[PDB]
């Protein structure tokens, strides 16, 4: 049984890490690249990149704890806690060589502590479409001159008393379609079938809660990263961001320059937040080229 179709030549499997059963999809041969999805999605957002990247690499795409088919974390949802699970997973598949990391949205939150604390384990880094948790996120406006902002969900999801779960219950599919499309520039790629699959996955009660627990731990992650960022990242890094409605635009590279000594950035025109789906062809090309150097 699978929540999402597994591409040909890939294996869907599970690995217990610190008492948490993690789901991942793996395929290919060569040095390891781990792809980490973000909120509202699963490993499947990578399914168009994975077959191309697998021609030169071993590719592994886990489901974040609590999302997709991965059990919730048993320590907590802060970046430093979740990063442990992903680090141990990656190192079991690349124990003796550094591996590459590609992360999108809250996949950044859940991998940054692993990267800065284990820099020798990371050969090349690709981060797309989310801030690394730090006090810059407190500057995003709640409301804008064009109406609804793209970041009010930070506070909705972080609200106590299970506000988000209570309001979204019974409206999971409606809410996720409006979240995804409001953060998109190219909405056509989110078919009814694709939205159905993503909605069924995050509508599992533990996955709905897990989704918001990442935001409830966001301030903890900010405080953790205030300490961790005293060490600059030294490996080659690439940032990608959407230049259209819904994306991070120039913020992504600008923030990353404060964290990384060796960074190149690209802003993809006509793309919002969901780069692997909205702009598959240019995003895949940029990722493959950067990792193949």
């Amino acid at each position, epitope marked *: 049984a699978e929540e999402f179709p597994v591409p040909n030549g890939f294996e869907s499997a599970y690995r217990e890490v610190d008492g948490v059963k993690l789901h991942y999809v793996k395929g290919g041969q060569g040095p390891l690249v781990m792809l980490v999805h973000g909120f509202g999605q699963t490993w499947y957002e990578w399914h168009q990149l994975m077959p191309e990247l697998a021609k030169r690499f071993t590719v592994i795409a886990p489901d974040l704890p609590g999302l997709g088919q991965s059990e919730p974390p048993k320590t907590g949802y802060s970046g430093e806690q979740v990063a442990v699970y992903l680090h141990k997973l990656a190192r079991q598949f690349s124990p003796d060589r550094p591996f590459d990391l590609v992360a999108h949205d809250i996949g950044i939150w859940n991998t940054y502590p692993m990267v800065v604390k284990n820099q020798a384990d990371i050969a090349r880094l690709v981060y797309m479409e989310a801030p690394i948790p730090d006090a810059r996120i407190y500057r*995003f406006p709640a409301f804008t001159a064009q109406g609804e*902002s793209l970041v009010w969900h930070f506070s909705f999801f972080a609200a106590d008393d299970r506000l988000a779960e209570t309001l979204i219950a019974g409206k999971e599919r409606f809410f996720l379609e409006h979240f995804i499309k409001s953060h998109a520039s190219n909405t056509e790629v989110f078919s009814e079938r694709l939205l159905d699959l993503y909605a069924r996955s995050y509508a599992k009660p533990h996955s709905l809660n897990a989704s918001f627990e990442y935001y409830r731990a966001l301030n903890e992650s900010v405080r953790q990263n205030a300490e961790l960022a005293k060490t600059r990242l030294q490996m080659p890094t690439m940032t990608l961001a959407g230049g259209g409605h819904g994306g991070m635009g120039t913020f992504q590279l600008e923030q990353m320059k404060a964290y990384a000594e060796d960074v190149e950035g690209h802003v993809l025109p006509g793309c919002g937040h969901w780069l692997p789906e909205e702009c598959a062809a240019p995003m895949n090309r940029l990722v493959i080229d950067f990792l193949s150097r």
Partner: nanobody
Framework: LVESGGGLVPAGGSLRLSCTTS????????MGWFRQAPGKEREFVAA???????????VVADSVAGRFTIFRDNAKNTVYLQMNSLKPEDTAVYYC?????????????????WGHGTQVTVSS
């Protein structure tokens, strides 16, 4: 690309121009207004960016600052130019265009060929 709202108006009066495109074109581009007077070069008027997580930005040319404002209606894929305190020198054909960012609009980049525009005539 649908441009409308122009017309004849007395000096001191007001007009609101609109520019509507397809959803993908609207969301993929900073949107801007330009104008060309009978024997002058085409002129940048105003622009508004797409919405990013940081917010948005909008700029107006010095010649209309404090009188014209620009804003998006993302539900309608329409950008509006609100024109207050109109002057005879605002008489021109007004054209809408888009570019990959707000600076490219002012640099010469344009994501579509110019449309028909909309005529604004301000009588003294």
């Amino acid at each position: 690309l649908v441009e409308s709202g122009g017309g004849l108006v007395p000096a001191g009066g007001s007009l609101r121009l609109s520019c509507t495109t397809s959803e993908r074109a609207f969301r993929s581009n900073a949107m801007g207004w330009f104008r060309q007077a009978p024997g002058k070069e085409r002129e940048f008027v105003a622009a508004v960016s797409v919405l990013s997580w940081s917010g948005d930005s909008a700029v107006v040319a010095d010649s209309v600052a404090g009188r014209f404002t620009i804003f998006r209606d993302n539900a309608k894929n329409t950008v509006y130019l609100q024109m207050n305190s109109l002057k005879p020198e605002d008489t021109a054909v007004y054209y809408c265009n888009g570019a990959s960012d707000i600076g490219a609009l002012q640099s010469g980049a344009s994501s579509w060929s110019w449309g028909h525009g909309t005529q604004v005539t301000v009588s003294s």
